[PDB]
Design an enzyme around this catalytic site. Structure first.
Site, short mmCIF file in Angstrom:
data_model
loop_
_atom_site.label_atom_id
_atom_site.label_comp_id
_atom_site.label_asym_id
_atom_site.label_seq_id
_atom_site.Cartn_x
_atom_site.Cartn_y
_atom_site.Cartn_z
N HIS A 27 -0.74 1.91 11.52
CA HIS A 27 -1.44 3.01 10.86
C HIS A 27 -2.79 2.55 10.32
O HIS A 27 -3.05 1.36 10.21
CB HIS A 27 -0.58 3.64 9.75
CG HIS A 27 -0.33 2.75 8.58
ND1 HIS A 27 0.77 1.93 8.49
CD2 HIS A 27 -1.04 2.54 7.44
CE1 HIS A 27 0.73 1.26 7.35
NE2 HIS A 27 -0.36 1.62 6.70
N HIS A 81 -8.72 6.79 13.80
CA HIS A 81 -8.43 7.25 12.45
C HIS A 81 -9.39 6.67 11.43
O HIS A 81 -9.77 7.35 10.48
CB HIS A 81 -7.00 6.88 12.05
CG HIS A 81 -5.94 7.73 12.67
ND1 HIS A 81 -5.98 9.11 12.62
CD2 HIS A 81 -4.80 7.40 13.31
CE1 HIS A 81 -4.90 9.59 13.21
NE2 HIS A 81 -4.16 8.58 13.63
N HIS A 123 -5.18 13.75 14.46
CA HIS A 123 -4.39 13.86 15.67
C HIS A 123 -4.78 15.05 16.52
O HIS A 123 -5.29 16.06 16.02
CB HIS A 123 -2.90 13.93 15.35
CG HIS A 123 -2.30 12.59 15.07
ND1 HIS A 123 -1.51 12.34 13.97
CD2 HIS A 123 -2.40 11.42 15.74
CE1 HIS A 123 -1.15 11.07 13.97
NE2 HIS A 123 -1.67 10.49 15.04
N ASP A 125 0.79 -1.23 0.00
CA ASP A 125 0.00 0.00 0.00
C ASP A 125 0.83 1.28 0.00
O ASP A 125 0.37 2.33 0.46
CB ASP A 125 -0.99 0.00 1.17
CG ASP A 125 -0.31 -0.06 2.51
OD1 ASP A 125 0.89 -0.40 2.57
OD2 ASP A 125 -0.99 0.22 3.52
N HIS A 160 -3.66 -1.49 9.77
CA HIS A 160 -2.56 -2.47 9.68
C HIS A 160 -1.54 -2.26 10.79
O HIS A 160 -1.06 -1.15 11.01
CB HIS A 160 -1.84 -2.36 8.33
CG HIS A 160 -2.75 -2.44 7.15
ND1 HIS A 160 -2.41 -1.92 5.92
CD2 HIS A 160 -4.00 -2.94 7.02
CE1 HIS A 160 -3.42 -2.10 5.08
NE2 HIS A 160 -4.39 -2.71 5.72
N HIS A 169 -6.24 3.76 19.00
CA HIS A 169 -5.76 4.96 18.33
C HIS A 169 -6.03 4.90 16.83
O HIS A 169 -6.56 5.84 16.23
CB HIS A 169 -4.25 5.11 18.58
CG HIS A 169 -3.65 6.33 17.97
ND1 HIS A 169 -3.67 7.56 18.59
CD2 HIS A 169 -2.99 6.52 16.80
CE1 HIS A 169 -3.06 8.45 17.83
NE2 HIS A 169 -2.63 7.84 16.74
N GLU A 170 -5.68 3.78 16.21
CA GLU A 170 -5.88 3.62 14.79
C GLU A 170 -7.38 3.64 14.45
O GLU A 170 -7.79 4.23 13.45
CB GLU A 170 -5.24 2.32 14.31
CG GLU A 170 -3.76 2.15 14.66
CD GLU A 170 -2.94 3.39 14.37
OE1 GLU A 170 -3.29 4.13 13.43
OE2 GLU A 170 -1.94 3.62 15.09
N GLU A 188 6.70 -5.82 15.86
CA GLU A 188 6.63 -5.19 17.17
C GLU A 188 6.42 -6.22 18.28
O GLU A 188 6.09 -7.37 18.01
CB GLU A 188 5.46 -4.20 17.20
CG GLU A 188 5.62 -3.01 16.28
CD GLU A 188 6.83 -2.19 16.62
OE1 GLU A 188 7.22 -2.18 17.80
OE2 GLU A 188 7.39 -1.54 15.72
CA LIG Z 1 7.69 -0.26 13.43
ZN LIG Z 2 -0.60 -0.58 5.52
ZN LIG Z 3 -2.13 8.39 14.62
#
Ligand SMILES: [Ca+2]
Ligand SMILES: [Zn+2]
Ligand SMILES: [Zn+2]
Ligand SMILES: C=CCC/N=C1/NN=C(c2ccc(Cl)cc2)CS1
Ligand SMILES: [Ca+2]
Length: 158
Positions: free
Chosen positions: A78, A117, A123, A65, A91, A113-114, A96
């Protein structure tokens, strides 16, 4: 400020991370979705397979992407703004250290958090706001959405 035109949205977890158990990924995601729900007219429904509005998945580096991940730390994950196909999907960086604790990085908090979005939020500049640009741990048990954030979805939808 695009927003969803539907209030009941479906979501799907396409894969998991060996870090936690399978029921620990869903609970984390499940709860992250409840936060926004109790502050808006949005209801989220889960589905095992099939097409879903918000697609959840763990990827590494290049994942098709034009927005590659960067390995441990740095870009934790994100999401995309309301829309079709990819719009709304979220995603997470698979490289991590996803935890259930206070250790970096708590999956619940990041997902929460995502998802903000995906629903259309941007933000915040309030260091206490969930939608603050940078990560920070906060007690997760009995955790509830910060007023700035409440003013957030409330300002888009209802
Ligand atoms: Ca990373
Ligand atoms: Zn992605
Ligand atoms: Zn963010
Ligand atoms: C930690 C927080 C990560 N938070 C983000 N959320 N999503 C972002 C994004 C913007 C545009 C496109 Cl195309 C993909 C992804 C900006 S970084
Ligand atoms: Ca989508």
């Amino acid at each position: 400020n695009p927003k969803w035109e539907r209030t009941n949205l479906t979501y799907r977890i396409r894969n998991y991370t060996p870090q936690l158990s399978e029921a620990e990924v869903e609970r984390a995601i499940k709860d992250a979705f409840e936060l926004w729900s109790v502050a808006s007219p949005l209801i989220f429904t889960r589905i095992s397979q099939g097409e879903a509005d918000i697609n959840i998945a763990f990827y590494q580096r290049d994942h098709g992407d034009n927005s590659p991940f960067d390995g441990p730390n740095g870009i934790l994950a994100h999401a995309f703004q309301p829309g079709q196909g990819i719009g709304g999907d979220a995603h997470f960086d698979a490289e991590e250290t996803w935890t259930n604790t206070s250790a970096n990085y708590n999956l619940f908090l990041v997902a929460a958090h995502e998802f903000g979005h995906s629903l259309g939020l941007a933000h915040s500049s309030d260091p206490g706001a969930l939608m603050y640009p940078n990560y920070a741990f906060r007690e997760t048990s009995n955790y509830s959405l910060p007023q700035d954030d409440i003013d957030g979805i409330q300002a888009i939808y209802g």
